[model samples]
Target: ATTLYLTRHGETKWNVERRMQGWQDSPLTEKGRQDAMRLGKRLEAVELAAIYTSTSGRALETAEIVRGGRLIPIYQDERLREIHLGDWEGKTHDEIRQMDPIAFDHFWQAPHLYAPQRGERFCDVQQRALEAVQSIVDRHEGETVLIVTHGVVLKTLMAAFKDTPLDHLWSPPYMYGTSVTIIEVDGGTFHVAVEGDVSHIE
Candidate 1:
């Protein structure tokens, strides 16, 4: 069996401001740094075989902080990037709400709807995220792999592991900054050892 560590990127400026920053190049917030450092310390002895991250600045920054010069081998894969919010990139909730309050609220409650203009659907987002995850598992058989990614991607993989319908992803809510989950993969079958097991954090 192959083990995988799934983690969300640390907090960001937009995360602090409660803005929906999708696929933006914002830097990590101070708390984000602290989270990364602490996460690294906690996982220092995890016996990791390799690490992978999204191609976004925030995710890459989080990977660097969390690694702390451990030379554990890192890989950047664009397929791990967050779902493109397109028009909603770098926009605040209130700004979107001001223009379409009802629709904004609906989107918040029903994530499947209200995708950003010209953006992909929920199923589409999951499909791409799944590709990233499946690719890693296929390439790194029987090794302990680490992937630092966005909340949406994590949720998608979790749903896929649980045998939930692809569309049912993003249903049980998303993971938070630095939240870590573990899953064991045997060939193509996935067994979730645990989900959002953040007890390792402070």
Candidate 2:
């Protein structure tokens, strides 16, 4: 079995501003950096074969902090990126609600019904994220690895792992910044050992 440690990137300026960050970029706040260090300390004793992170800057920054002085090779994969929000990227929730009320409502209240005008659907994120996971599993069977990604990406992946439908993707265990989720993978099966844990944060 292979152990996968999944983590969301630390908080960012856009997060503080309640702005959508899909396929966009933002720098981590000071607290975000601190939290990443704390998470790093929490995993200090674990042996990781390698680290996989989204191509986004925030995720890569968090991966760097979590890696600290470790020599683990870090691989940046675009498949793990957050759902593309198209015109919604970098916009505040309030602004989106004003511009596209129904679609915005469906995004949170009825994700399965969400139809972005120029963005990716939840199913799209699930497919790409799963592909990335499969490739990683193929390359590092029986090894432990870390994946740093975004909230939506993590949620979609978790939904697949738990066999939960896409509409219930936001059901519970809200993913905080730098939250950690653990999973055990064997062959084609997945076992979620932990979900959205932030105990390492102070």
Candidate 3:
């Protein structure tokens, strides 16, 4: 059996401000580093065989902290990065609502119908995120792997792993920063061992 550990990046300055990250970058806050270290110790005994992360600085930082003294190699993949928020990259929730009230409402209330110009489409995010995940699974057969990514990417993968349709992409609640989600895969079959587990942080 191959196990995949999916985790979101630690909280960042942008996260604290409630800004849209997308492909934009932000440094992890002091507390974010602390939580990531906690996450590192939490999974110290997991026997992880390999690790992957987003190209974003925050995700890369989180992956490094998680590795800690461990001897796992961390690889970066753009596909594992967050959704491209386009013009909304650095905007806050309230700011976005004011800029485009109709689209902002659609974003949370009807994800399938919401589309931002120059931003990544929900279906496209699902496609690339799934591709990134599948590639990792295929490369690490019968071994354990960890992927450090973003909230939107994780949510998209959550939908895929739960067999939820793309139309219901936003149905699952957002994952907390540095949360761990586990999936066990055997050949063509996959089972979710956990989802958005932040128990270690507490």
Candidate 4:
């Protein structure tokens, strides 16, 4: 079985400001750095074969912190980036709601039916994210690996692992910054050992 540890990036300046990051970028906050270090400490006992992170700055920063001078190989993959928000990128929730109320509602309330005006859809994110993970699993069979990515990407992957429908993507525990999820893959079977765990930060 292959043990896969997945996590979202630490909180960012934009995250604190309630801004949509999407393809845009922002530096991690001080608290973000501290929480990432905590997460690194928690994983110090686990031997990781490799580390994969999104090309986004936040994700890469968190990956570095989690690695903590370890010699493990780290790869930056664009496919693991957050969903492209297009017009919504860099805007606050209130701004988006006022600018495009219907789209905003669909995004949070009915993601499966969401049809982005310019950005990629939820299904698009799932397809690319799944492909990236499949490639990673193929390369590191029966080994443990780490993946640092964005909230939507992590949630989409979790939905696939749990067989949860897209409509229920936001069900239950939220994917907080630096939250970790563990999954074990045996052949074609996936067992979710943990989901949205933030005990280290707590």
Q: For every model shown, what is its TM-score relative to the native structure? A: 0.90, 0.98, 0.96, 0.98
Q: What is candidate 2's TM-score against the reference? A: 0.98
How displaced is residue 71 in candidate 2, in Å? 0.7
For model 3, how does the per-residue alpha-carbon lDDT over 1-202 read when each residue is reduced to its tens digit? 6899998988899989999888989999999999999999989999899999989999999999999968899999989888888889899999988888987787777788888888888778889988998899899888999999887788878988899977787785668888889999986677889988888898
Task: Indicate the residue-level lDDT of 58 in model 2.
Answer: 93
Question: 4-42, model 4: which lDDT tens digit per residue?
Answer: 999988889999999999899999999999999999999
- Per-residue lDDT over 81-173 for candidate 2, one digit per residue giving the tens place of the 0 to 100 score: 999999998999999899999999999999999998789999999999999999999999889999999989999999999999998989998
List residue ranges in candidate 2 displaced over 4 A. none
Q: What value does the lDDT take at residue 34 in candidate 2?
A: 96
Candidate that would win on lDDT: 2
Candidate 4 wrong stretches, greater than 4 Å: none
In candidate 1, stretches whose alpha carbon ends up further than 4 angstroms from where it belongs are 165-174
| Stronger candidate by lDDT (1 vs 2) | 2
Error of 2 at 84 (Å): 0.3
User: Ranking under lDDT, best-scoring first?
Assistant: 2, 4, 3, 1
How close is each model in CA RMSD to the real structure?
2.0, 0.8, 1.2, 0.8
Q: Which residues of candidate 3, in runs, are more than 4 Å off? A: none
